[PDB]
Amino acid sequence: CRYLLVRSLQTFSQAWFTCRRCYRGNLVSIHNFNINYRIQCSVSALNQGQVWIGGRITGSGRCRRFQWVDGSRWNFAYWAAHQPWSRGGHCVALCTRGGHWRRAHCLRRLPFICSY
Ligand SMILES: [Cl-]
């Protein structure tokens, strides 16, 4: 899986369409632990504690159906302790320290990982 770290802080939608606009891809869609580690390796120097990825807790009310923007299936997740319920927004963000996933509010401006 090819992935590119963009260091500019942008909202989720911004990042999503930024990946599509600049590199013709999407926000990274992680499907195993290897990619999660390599992506964790690429975000070991980021001061920002989190980075956006393609995850979406998209559910009408309380359906809370995790889904990737890229459309790929949702078969893997590396959730942090005390996650991912009763906290956070609708958009997922990978914690730079450790590599565990979080739930963040989409309007937050954080670095992101573009796939290509
Ligand atoms: Cl939100």
From Swiss-Prot:
Residues 1-116 form the C-type lectin domain. It comes from the Eukaryota. It is found in: Cytoplasmic vesicle, Secretory vesicle. Changing residue 73 to C: In a colorectal cancer sample; somatic mutation. Disulfide bonds join 19-114, 91-106. This is Eosinophil granule major basic protein. The chain holds residues 107 to 222 of 222 of the full protein.
